[PDB]
């Protein structure tokens, strides 16, 4: 996890700038560490890069191929049921 740690370190930056330069440098290094691993985790995992939050219309095209291929199967199966009963 890097998201809550980034949040928290962000908040003790914005709460206490009066800390000596040592703490500021160390904490900024810590955030650089967390975002470095963030880029590493992104880079090494395929699923988290394919699904980068947003839905283009490809989901609606999946729904169109799904619905058109289902109903034609139902129609042909109805035709087979009607024909074979003789």
């Amino acid at each position: 996890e890097f998201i809550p740690h980034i949040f928290y370190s962000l908040h003790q930056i914005r709460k206490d700038p009066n800390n000596l330069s040592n703490q500021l440098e160390t904490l900024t290094g810590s955030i650089r560490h967390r975002l470095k691993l963030c880029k590493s985790l992104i880079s090494e995992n395929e699923d988290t890069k394919d699904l980068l939050s947003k839905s283009p219309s490809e989901w609606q095209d999946i729904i169109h191929q799904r619905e058109q291929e289902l109903q034609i199967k139902r129609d042909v199966l109805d035709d087979l049921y009607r024909k074979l009963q003789r």
Binding site: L10, H11, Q12, R14, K15, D16, P17
Partner: protein, 365 residues
Amino acid sequence: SYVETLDSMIELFKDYKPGSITLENITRLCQTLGLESFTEELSNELSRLSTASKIIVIDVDYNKKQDRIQDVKLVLASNFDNFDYFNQRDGEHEKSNILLNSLTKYPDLKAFHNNLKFLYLLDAYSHKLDLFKYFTELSHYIRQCFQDNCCDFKVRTNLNDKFGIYILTQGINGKEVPLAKIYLEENKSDSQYRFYEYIYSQETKSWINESAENFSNGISLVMEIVANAYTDLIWFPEDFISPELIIDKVTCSSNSSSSPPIIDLFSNNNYNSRIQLMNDFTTKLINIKKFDISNDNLDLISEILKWVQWSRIVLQNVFKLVSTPVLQLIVSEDHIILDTISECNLYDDVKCWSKFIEKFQDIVS
């Protein structure tokens, strides 16, 4: 200028990301204000965060199982225990605690930080002037001053989970509308500025300083105009109030041409074709948000509020009606004349102002 810029950046960061409501962030906020803080375990389910200063002690009860604040108590180490930290709502038997509400009703610590900064200001600047006592009593003195001066203003303490003395008017629907907020602020300009106790005497019908020995240094009593918000801004004649009493002048920074919409309405030929507008203002109109009303300036509260009310009822409505696409309309600082048909001035009653606007609307429609 480095320290002033750094303080301005720190104030900006505190306001931009107040932090989430957690026990740790509340403790860090109190420590950032220089408040002493300790945590006690009252039970397996309840922890108390106690924070203290010179006069104030704040106990915050935290439910460890629910991840929620359960209670907040303010205690004063002053001889004055009667400080009102509840919201004034008419008709609710449950006085809702401002500090508790600021930690339970809001998504962030911003409401709590502002209320804590106000309590810390009273704490730091109270001595023999007790600002907790004086600020509580001041709300009663202002209420009396309005009764004695026949001003149709209501005084409430603590509106919308915020510390302050709120001055309300009746709006068109009988709904109370805040006009102004009175509160104490640190005097950034003069640390040697003496703030005295002024009492409204029923006998003299005037503000009096009973104890010129009772003062605090580096604090001002501020009157802030509560805009309902550019047409909802209140504009004042430049010479209406001494420039030394103006804390916050909204400088229209020199890259957006927003004249007062009033002055653009003397320059732009897009009028109701039935009205010839005449400007008789002798002074420039300035937007003022905050006034110093400290010491001898407490008499100005009634004059400022009458102007704010007259500007809302008369001026802003006249401007709205003229701006919506031949009678002469003369508009001056303290009087408005519609040919020989109707007039009103700043010293007339609110009923005369309403009758003027009704007649003006009937002619312009």
